[PDB]
Amino acid sequence: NNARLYQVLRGPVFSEKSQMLGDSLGVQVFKIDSKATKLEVKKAVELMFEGVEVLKVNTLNVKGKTKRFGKNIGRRNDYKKAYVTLKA
Amino acid sequence: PIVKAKPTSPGRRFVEKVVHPHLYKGRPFAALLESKSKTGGRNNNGRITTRHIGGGHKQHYRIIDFKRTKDNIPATVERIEYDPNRTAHIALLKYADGERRYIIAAKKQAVGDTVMSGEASPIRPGNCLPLKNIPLGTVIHNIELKIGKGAQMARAAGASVQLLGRDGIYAILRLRSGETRRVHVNCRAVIGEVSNTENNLKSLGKAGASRWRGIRPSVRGVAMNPVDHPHGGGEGRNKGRHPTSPWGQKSKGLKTRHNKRTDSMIIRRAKK
Amino acid sequence: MKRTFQPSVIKRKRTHGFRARMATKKGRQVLARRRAKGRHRLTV
RNA sequence: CGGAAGAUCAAGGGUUCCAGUCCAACGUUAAUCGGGGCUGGGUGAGUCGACCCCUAAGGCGAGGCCGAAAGGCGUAGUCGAUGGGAAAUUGGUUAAUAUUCCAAUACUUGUUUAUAGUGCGAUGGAGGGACGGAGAAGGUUAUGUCAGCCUGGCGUUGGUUGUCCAGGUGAAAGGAUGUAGGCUUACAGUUUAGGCAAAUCCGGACUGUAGGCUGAGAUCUGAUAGCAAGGAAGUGGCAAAUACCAUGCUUCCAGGAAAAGCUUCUAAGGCUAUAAACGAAUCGUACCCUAAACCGACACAGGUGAUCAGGUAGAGAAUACCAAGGCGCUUGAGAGAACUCUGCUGAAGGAACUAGGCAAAAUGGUACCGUAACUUCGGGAGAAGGUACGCUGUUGAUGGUGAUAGGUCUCCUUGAGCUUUCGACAGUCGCAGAUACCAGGCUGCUGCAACUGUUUAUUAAAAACACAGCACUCUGCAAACACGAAAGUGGACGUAUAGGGUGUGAUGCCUGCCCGGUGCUGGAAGGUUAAUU
């Protein structure tokens, strides 16, 4: 439907990899739902940034790090991020 | 025949192998084959229920027609093959209608001859006949015990039975064990003696030749401790006890036959 | 020298795992006993 | 160090990976450093692997069988990889990912639409997939080495513009082609005791007519890529794998997975070509992995499967020195006693040591000569014991590859260049030429066990166990025997030339007497004898 595509993109990634990729290949890096396929991401980007056409989507699951605090051992959420290529 | 090996190695000094240059050097007929994995002499409980089994060479099962229910249809011996599942050789049959089967091979049976099954069949090695259509005194093998069940007795290399006579609806036979036996006259048998008559004549030569056949070493009971065998125990060498199996059963003459329903099918045995 | 543990994940989950416990009457008694003690680790 | 202490993984671990920052604790010392603390970043796939389809051992197992209960077994099935089943390589790029990103060039498999032609369809039938050990002769390549070519250099000390020195320099998958090899008569027709029914498909029986499949590598294309000093080269010889041809070939017995994918046939009742567009999900991907990250409580001298495999010598994956790459093993500084450990050398003697030549010393290579008792004729045997070995020059013989010519991935003769293996003669230097590392000590008598093997993980490796062979005995098949409570199993889809138990233990010569005891086998005249009545 069109009420599940609003929850596919969790937020853009701001890093040296994401900033270097944009300037050279114009590929947006996003943090996506833990259940979003490559098709859902493709259908979420083009609906929600009108005027762009996605060539490909490269997804990956990256695991959260164990960051201990105080007396406890705790881990960060795992998350999924996608590289999406837009038509030049 | 037998061929002694030259003593080029200590393991080859007493290797006397049986050699048959007339048996197929190719592969068995594919469709009459079945996968068959070793059991290590273990039952469905995973327990060793027969010792000294384990190892050996992988081998297929050849489906031997022990029944021979293709009567009045002639079959020609296509080839005589070696069988790893038994000591006897096996003849690849080629029935008129093209159906191919394996049977135990008679000693006097070559490639090209025709074999017959049924009641109106010639008395020649290979043919399968009911015991009433076989004249007395001929040498037979592949003896049936139940009607229609297939050959049970005299199926090993060199096996043969003497059809001594008839006393009604039974057929008096003299088995190679020396036991005279009556069998229903409607049961079938094959004419001739079983091939590979020089099998007992061989010599393995080395411990590894018995390992190739799936046989594991056997430890004498007097080489054990008393917690493992009744023969176990002793300072030095000693027997001390009457000979007995590891389960406590005499092994020097104790007769072990429990059947009381087949007791009337046995005429006598032989004393020597 | 070779030591006693020598881990294997498929072998661990197949002899001590959750589904291995639940496939026997006595394995379910193991799980019930871990739960009654309040253990945070039921199965390996 | 360099058959790793270098690289790629699997397992296992799980962020240890990269950067910035800090030095309390941790690191056997210090620490500004770290696999430590803290804060950020990092793992990109239709083609790699998993998942998926298929099955092995082995599980579970509608109904079924068995069992006080719990449960045990088992059919159809359904799971279960360590195996079978589709497909890409080169190069660049990040601090950290790369067959994933980017560039170039490919490949595999689907969906939808259209144009034609048109009998399609299986969980079933038949093919196929599909397989053992050893060995041998080749043909190759990866790779190496020299040469060519390009770019630099003219050398702190005699000489070095040359036949000099250094560095660099060889593009793959794929597509054409079809070679060295390997296999191999083809078609048509008639018909049918068979493949559980059916079948045009297989199998079987008859009648006429007379190169193909596979396949390394080379070649062409791919191919004006990329790659250094700021805009260069990029092609010839020789050598050569354990990798490929090759799941081949030849042999032997110990006789060599299964199932599916795939090709065909029909049973009940859409398919094949042509393209055009579109797609190929999800999970893993960092990093260690002969280890400081795994198993050993430790940053522990242990253990840990697979893959890659440079040079000079060398038979070699031994050994020595090096390459690429990676390290100096997380306390140092002194001194240079006894004593301890690990080594080197040792006058004269040479086992006098000692329980005992324990340890040490010694031998050690290749070729040729020569070699005893005894023997099962194989052996013993490398018995024992000798001689030669470096370098330089000349010279004889020889295998391979083959440019140039003479008579189309071709054939024949000649043979340049390179290379192989053997000799002879002459000279020459040293104490010493198998110069280093590496690398048998050998004999005589005698007990034991035939031998190869096995064993007390962690004080015993042996004469102990096993062993081929021998004997006795049991067992006629629902076999004896064994597991089990039984069902169900093994024995065995075996059948007395078989299977079990027991003893002995190759082989040669052999294996005497005793049946009183205790077993075992056979017999029943008599005596005694249970429940029961």
Numbering used by the authors:
A (entry chain Sn): 2 to 89
B (entry chain Cl): 2 to 273
C (entry chain Ba): 1 to 44
From the paper:
The observation of EF-Tu bound to P. urativorans ribosomes in complex with Balon was unexpected. The cryo-EM data, in conjunction with our mass spectrometry analysis, showed that about 44% of Balon-containing ribosomes were also bound to EF-Tu, the universally conserved translation factor known to deliver aminoacyl-tRNA molecules to the ribosomal A site during protein synthesis. To investigate the role of EF-Tu in ribosome hibernation, and to gain insights into the mechanism of Balon recruitment to the ribosome, we used focused classification to enrich ribosomes simultaneously bound to both Balon and EF-Tu (about 44% of particles). Domains III and II of EF-Tu are well ordered. The overall conformation of EF-Tu resembles that of the open state of EF-Tu(GDP)42 (root mean square deviation (RMSD) 1.9 Å) and not the closed state of EF-Tu(GTP)43 (RMSD 13.8 Å). Whereas Balon, aeRF1 and Pelota all use their conserved C-terminal domain to recognize EF-Tu or its homologues, Balon uses a distinct surface on its C-terminal domain. This alternative EF-Tu-recognition site includes a unique β-loop and is about 20 Å away from the corresponding site in aeRF1 and Pelota. The weak Balon–EF-Tu association is therefore stabilized in the context of the ribosome, possibly by the additional interactions that we observe between EF-Tu, the ribosomal L7/L12 stalk (protein bL12) and the 16S rRNA helix h5.
